[PDB]
Amino acid sequence: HGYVESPASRAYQCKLQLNTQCGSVQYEPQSVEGLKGFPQAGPADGHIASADKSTFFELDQQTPTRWNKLNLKTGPNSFTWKLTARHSTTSWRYFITKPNWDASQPLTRASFDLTPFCQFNDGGAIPAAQVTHQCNIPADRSGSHVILAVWDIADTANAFYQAIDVNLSK
């Protein structure tokens, strides 16, 4: 259980009241939990941002202006998770939408480049309460994009999914 605090994820921005019409997740941003194994298995297409959890359905809405986007530069960026439960961890992966994705369609595997721009494999270790990853956001992305941070749990069937809405510039 945890969420990306910086750059603030869609779920966390819902808690901060920066996003609108978020429903349940604004009261529990740390619990966007679904099945692991993405992209071969995992949440179904169109249900990735909610991790296919019924009460988190609002997160699966997607339009060009639907979500509040953080202005970031491409290149070196830090991603920090705040964990409320430090579960034994298989991996942390950060994916970004394709260069020419469509923000007016639901998030599906076709929306994302399925080669993460960075990945950290922890071998089942128990993480600290705050975990920070430093990676380069691909420089060939500009404007509105979604970064999907995925945390796969080693000792359960689950993973946590954190969509992050961003507006990139050089």
From TrEMBL:
SUPFAM superfamilies tied to this protein: E set domains (SSF81296)
Subcellular location(s) of the protein: Secreted
One Pfam family recorded for the sequence: LPMO_10
Molecular function GO terms recorded: monooxygenase activity
Disulphide bond pairs: 14-22, 118-135
GO cellular component: extracellular region
CDD domains with a match to the protein in the record: LPMO_AA10
Alphabetical keyword list: Monooxygenase, Oxidoreductase, Secreted, Signal
Transmembrane segments: none
GO BP of this protein: chitin catabolic process
Residue ranges occupied by any Chitin-binding type-4 domain in the UniProt entry: 1-166
PANTHER family in alphabetical order: CHITIN-BINDING TYPE-4 DOMAIN-CONTAINING PROTEIN, GLCNAC-BINDING PROTEIN A
Protein's recorded name: Chitin-binding protein
Organism expressing this protein natively: Serratia marcescens
Lineage: Bacteria, Pseudomonadati, Pseudomonadota, Gammaproteobacteria, Enterobacterales
